[PDB]
Each structure stands twice: as C-alpha cells, then as structure tokens.
Amino acid sequence: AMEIVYDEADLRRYFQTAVLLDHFLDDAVEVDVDAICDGEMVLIGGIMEHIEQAGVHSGDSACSLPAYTLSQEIQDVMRQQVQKLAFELQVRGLMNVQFAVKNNEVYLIEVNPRAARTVPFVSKATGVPLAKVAARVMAGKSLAEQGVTKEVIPPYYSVKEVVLPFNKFPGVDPLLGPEMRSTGEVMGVGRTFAEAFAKAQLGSNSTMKKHGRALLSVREGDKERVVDLAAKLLKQGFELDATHGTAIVLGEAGINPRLVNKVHEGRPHIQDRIKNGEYTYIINTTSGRRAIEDSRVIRRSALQYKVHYDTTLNGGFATAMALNADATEKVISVQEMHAQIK
Amino acid sequence: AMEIVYDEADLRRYFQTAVLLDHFLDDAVEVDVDAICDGEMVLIGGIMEHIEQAGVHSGDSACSLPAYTLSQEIQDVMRQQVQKLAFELQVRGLMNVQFAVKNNEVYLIEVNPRAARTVPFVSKATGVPLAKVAARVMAGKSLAEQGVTKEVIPPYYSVKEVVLPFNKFPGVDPLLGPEMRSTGEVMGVGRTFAEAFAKAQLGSNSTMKKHGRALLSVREGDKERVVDLAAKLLKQGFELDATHGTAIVLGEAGINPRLVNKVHEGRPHIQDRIKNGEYTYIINTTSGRRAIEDSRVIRRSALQYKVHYDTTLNGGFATAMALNADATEKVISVQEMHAQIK
Ligand SMILES: Nc1ncnc2c1ncn2[C@@H]1O[C@H](COP(=O)(O)OP(=O)(O)O)[C@@H](O)[C@H]1O
Ligand SMILES: Nc1ncnc2c1ncn2[C@@H]1O[C@H](COP(=O)(O)OP(=O)(O)O)[C@@H](O)[C@H]1O
Ligand SMILES: NCCC[C@H](N)C(=O)O
Ligand SMILES: NCCC[C@H](N)C(=O)O
Ligand SMILES: [Cl-]
Numbered sequence A, B: 001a002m003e004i005v006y007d008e009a010d011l012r013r014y015f016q017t018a019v020l021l022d023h024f025l026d027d028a029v030e031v032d033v034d035a036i037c038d039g040e041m042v043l044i045g046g047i048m049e050h051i052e053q054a055g056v057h058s059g060d061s062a063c064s065l066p067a068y069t070l071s072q073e074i075q076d077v078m079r080q081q082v083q084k085l086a087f088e089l090q091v092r093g094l095m096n097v098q099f100a101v102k103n104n105e106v107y108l109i110e111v112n113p114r115a116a117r118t119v120p121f122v123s124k125a126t127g128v129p130l131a132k133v134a135a136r137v138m139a140g141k142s143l144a145e146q147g148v149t150k151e152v153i154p155p156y157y158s159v160k161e162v163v164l165p166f167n168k169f170p171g172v173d174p175l176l177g178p179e180m181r182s183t184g185e186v187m188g189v190g191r192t193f194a195e196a197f198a199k200a201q202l203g204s205n206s207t208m209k210k211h212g213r214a215l216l217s218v219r220e221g222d223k224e225r226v227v228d229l230a231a232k233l234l235k236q237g238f239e240l241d242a243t244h245g246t247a248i249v250l251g252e253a254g255i256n257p258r259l260v261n262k263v264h265e266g267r268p269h270i271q272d273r274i275k276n277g278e279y280t281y282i283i284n285t286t287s288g289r290r291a292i293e294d295s296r297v298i299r300r301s302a303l304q305y306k307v308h309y310d311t312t313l314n315g316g317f318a319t320a321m322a323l324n325a326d327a328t329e330k331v332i333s334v335q336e337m338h339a340q341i342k
C-alpha cells in the first residue's frame, strides 16, 4: 500500500482505515536514472524524466529520454549523486536511482541496486545493451575492458508510455497514484518530444482525437495552469466544457467554456454528457481522498465510453503537444535509429 | 396585505407570520381597460397592455397604449366582456377593468366602477378627456349627446413608466409585486413601441446604458425565455455574466456567458462586481419567499450602485427593444399628437 495525507484530519482519517512517514514532494518532477558501476567507474545508462509528477508511480508514468524540461545543470547534479551513491553502496552491475526535483533542488526517492524495469527501454533508446554490459561487469569484465564507458544521448526522443488494466475491473476508480497498476508499456520515437509522445500515446491505444469538445475539471492547485491548457485546446479547434470552479477560473482569464453540471448540481451533468458522446477529451485532476471518491464518476464514465482522459495537468500538456504531431507521418527502424547514434 | 404562496409548506409558513384564496395566474399578461358607460352604450376609453406580468401590481407596471403584443382577437373579448359588465353593473360615467390573459384565455381580475389612476394617461394618449366626458355623462348628458361614441386608436405608441421611492428607503428590497409602491409616473410617445418605451424609460430616470456588461440571473420559469434576451443583449454589444443555473441554460443554447459566483459561493461574487461598477445592466428574476430573501442583496446592491435593473423578463425584453431606439431623436408636442388622430 501507499497513501497521501493532506491534513491533520486526513491523518487520523487514514489512521482509522489504516509506519514510515515522509513529506510528499508536491509539484515535483520525477526522474529515473539507470546506471552501471564496475567498482572503477559509473556509467549513466539513461536519465528519464517522467511526464507525471512525483506521486504517480514511475511504473505508471510516461517518460522521456532525454529529459524534455530538465536543465542540464540539474541533470548534472543527478548524475553526480548517482555516482556518489554507486561507489558508496558498492554496486557491481545495474542500479537505478529515483529523484524528485522540486524548486531546483534534487531530492532522493530511492535506490534500486539491481536491474530496473526501465532497463529495456533505455537499451532500446540508446543502442546500449545494458543488461549485457552489466552482466559482463558482474561476471568480471570492467566497463573500460568492454569499451562502454560513455553515456549515450540519442539524437532523437524516446518516449515511454504505459497501459493500465482498469478496463478489466470497471469497479475500480481509474486514477493514477503512488501505487503501480500498469501491465505494460510501449515506446514512441520522434524527432521531437511532441512526435515521440504522440507515437507513444497512440501505441498505448489512446482514443485521443484532434477535434471535438474537451471537458476541463481541475483541482484548485491546477486552476492556474489550466488556463494555458485551455488556450492550447482552443487554438487546436476544440470546444470546451467545464465545471463550476474551473469555469470561474477560465472566465476570469478571458475563457468562457460551456458550463457543465456536476452530478449533484443537476442536468444535464458530465456523466450524461459523457454517456452521450459529447466529449472527445477529458482533463480531470483531483486532490484528496474525499474529492477523489466524489469525482470518481468522471473517470469511470470516461473509461466506459472510451474517451481519452488525462488525470494530471502534466499529462494534459503532453497530450496537447502531441496534437501538433502526426504519429503516422514517419516511421523509423531500430537499426536506423541505432545507426544515427554518433 | 397580499402575498403569493406556492406550496403546502409555503402556505402554513405564511399563516405563521400571518381571508381570500385565489388561483395564481402564472406567466400571464395583465391588461387595463378604462371606459365610459351611460346605460345606453359603452365607450372604450383605452386598452393598456402591462409590460410586467400579472403578479406585479398595475400601479407599478409599465404599460402600453395600444397593446404591443396582444392580439386583436383577444382585445375584442375583453372589449366584449367590459361592456357586459358596464351594463350589468349599471355603470354610469367611468369604469375600469383588469384582465389577465393566460393561454389565450381572458380571466377577470377586478372591476372598478369609478375613475382609475390610468385615466389621465389614456386621456393624454388618445386626446379624449375621459374625465369630463364621464362627468357630462354623470350629469345627464349621454355619450351620444356629447358626440363621443367611438373608441379612438392612436397612430403612435404611448408608454407609461413608473418611478419608485426605494431610494428613499434603503432597508427595503427594491422589488416589485402585488402591492403598489410607486409614487409617480412618466410618459413616452413614439412611432414604435421601442421608441415609446425608450422615452418612458429615460423619463423615469433610468441609468440604463447602451453598452458594457450585463448580469443575468433568472428564475427557473424564466430560464427558457432568457436565451432570447441574452441573444438580444449580445447583438447590442454587451458582455455577459451569469450565475450558475442561468449560465447552464445559456450554454445549452450556444451562449457562454462569463460565470459568476453568488455571494455564498466565492470571490469575487456578484456583490463585489456590482459594487465595482462592473455592470451597466442587471436582469434578475426570482420566485419564492426564500429565493427572494436570498437574492435581496442583488437588488439592493444594484439600486445602491445605480445600475439599471429589471426584475421581470418582460421588463428586460422591453429594455432590450428600447436599445434599438433613441429617445432623443424626435420630439413631438401634445398638440401635434392630437392632431394626428382620426
Ligand atoms: N517523498 C515523496 N514525494 C513525492 N512522491 C513520492 C515520495 N515518495 C514516493 N513518492 C512516489 O511514490 C512512488 C513509489 O515510491 P517508491 O519509494 O519508489 O516505492 P516502490 O518501491 O514501489 O518503487 C514514486 O515512484 C513516487 O511517485
Ligand atoms: N388571480 C390573480 N392572478 C395573478 N395576478 C393577480 C391576481 N389577482 C391580482 N393579481 C395581481 O395583483 C394586483 C392586485 O390585484 P387587485 O385585486 O387588482 O388589487 P388592488 O385592490 O390593489 O387594485 C393586480 O394588479 C395583479 O398584478
Ligand atoms: N502514463 C499514465 C496513463 C495516463 C492516463 N491517461 C491518465 O492520465 O490517468
Ligand atoms: N415598471 C417598474 C419599474 C421597473 C424596475 N426596473 C424593475 O424591473 O423592478
Ligand atoms: Cl470490477
């Protein structure tokens, strides 16, 4: 298990239902780092920046190699910490290090001193067979002896997206969190981030469309960045609907979405609107046990009626960017990809 | 003392703070008819169609001479009805009748076998000193004898608007009802109902503007018709704001107003905006002792801030028609007016 308590009252509440305690790094970028240590040196296999923020398990987060928003400066910091950790822990073969970047500061989430699930994706994206290398290291052949001593940074973007099994258990609230529920993943290769993400989104079987009406229903903390996402959808040709508070926020910024009723507010409401095929896209972010349990019907209908939905603002942005790409425009083979690697 | 009750609950509730019970003719057109009978015949002095529906006391209703929406067919029955009354009642001199028109049916409200407060208006509009005629009649000189026998229909529209003393008494909810509160009245003469109403409106000291932002917040029964008014305002160049329910309705119709918060909903709310002179027009309609008490702050606020406001949808429609006209375009003397009559 894993849960995120927001306030004192939430604490006891949880406790009632319910021990390590940890400050939840809100509004942080999650990063994964795969590396090999031979006792002599440390090789960075790959720095992957997650699309979904810290708080959504990495196994359920889409990610990019290379990072699409992290500064080189901060990545360099993560690279140095990985090395510090590698040598100190006595790693010999693979390791994976997870961070959270909040306010230009690097925080450590955890160290997995072994092969991590991102190893295949990184190998594919970079042309380096990490498990083959780390296995030789473990058996006794150094990285220097193998001629694998420099971190590779591909000339293209590699985006990994996941597939979740919620459709198999419709009674479950289809939302992301600190616990992993995904079964698999796909990879998208693009000239740009938008291009890789688009191919990854499509590969994951997304029903995302390039037109239609979008439903925006976000949490307080997102209300501010929503405006921009709303502008983006607008410039794309989407029409918009929104719930009360979200509408309030848009209006104030000059955006007037068409108001939609909350299930308790009356009719018609979102469920009806979703059930009746009015939307081609949904962005609904929530925060707090109670608020979640309450918004459960949005997510559930969206999944039922096959409407593409994002449950993170970060995901919404990414989806928005891909709107600008065409995943069927161009294709590349793995051999070509690896040949482009200088 | 007169009040309107809506349900069982409502009735006792009254009874508490609290006898004739009368069906309430909801969504009906109120009409006033002034006439003279001499036992021999009946002369129709004037048929005035109120702008505010039945439920808004005659003395506080703006009215039109001649009717501005009413059918000839309907007028004729009223006309017939009056007569019948004039005789049965044995009326000799002046009389006034008030009808209500629901679903093309004419209901009888009250008959006043004397001179009504409308007489001077009618007299000025039509050119006939109803007062003297009736006087001559009362003193033995028949309509026939006098040479006044056929109902006069003017060639221009005459609109009567009233003035309320609410500003002298602020603790008062400046809202209309079955009880008269006005002190005086003004007259507007025009080629079109719109032009007459525009003059009457200006004449009544209205602060209505020809631009800015409107605030719409109407009751359920009105929610339907409001769309058309919204559209009209829209055509005139106004920007719109609406409270939730109203914003929904509008949206369902293609109109996305800017969503605003009621007072208990958040900040800023309507009071805040009114207070900041955010609006140039407000349309607020309400049903229920509760909805009314609850909306009180809207009206007091508007009154206090000098924003023109309508408390009836019919009123709003008229305000809107008037936006088409220009009260200062043409001036006409009473002498001239009377000269045009055939
Ligand atoms: N302090 C924290 N702040 C923010 N997010 C965190 C924090 N600790 C854990 N998480 C989130 O929870 C997920 C799982 O935590 P982790 O320690 O890596 O568990 P696991 O062993 O299942 O991999 C992370 O991938 C991350 O999104
Ligand atoms: N049955 C009714 N249905 C709807 N409105 C009514 C009804 N009876 C009266 N009214 C409204 O209340 C007002 C007052 O009624 P009325 O009997 O004419 O009172 P008053 O003696 O003050 O002139 C009317 O001018 C009208 O707007
Ligand atoms: N990478 C996780 C899958 C994203 C899913 N559309 C969601 O936003 O919940
Ligand atoms: N004819 C009565 C005055 C109208 C006022 N604006 C109101 O609608 O309450
Ligand atoms: Cl299930």
Ligand SMILES: [K+]
Binding pocket: A030, A050, A051, A052, A053, A054, A055, A056, A057, A058, A061
């Ligand atoms: K994450």
Ligand SMILES: [K+]
Binding pocket: A110, A112
């Ligand atoms: K772990």
Ligand SMILES: [K+]
Binding pocket: B030, B050, B051, B052, B053, B054, B055, B056, B057, B058, B061
């Ligand atoms: K009336």
Ligand SMILES: [K+]
Binding pocket: B110, B112
């Ligand atoms: K009376």
Ligand SMILES: [Mn+2]
Binding pocket: A058, A098, A110
């Ligand atoms: Mn982990």
Ligand SMILES: [Mn+2]
Binding pocket: B058, B098, B110
């Ligand atoms: Mn009356």
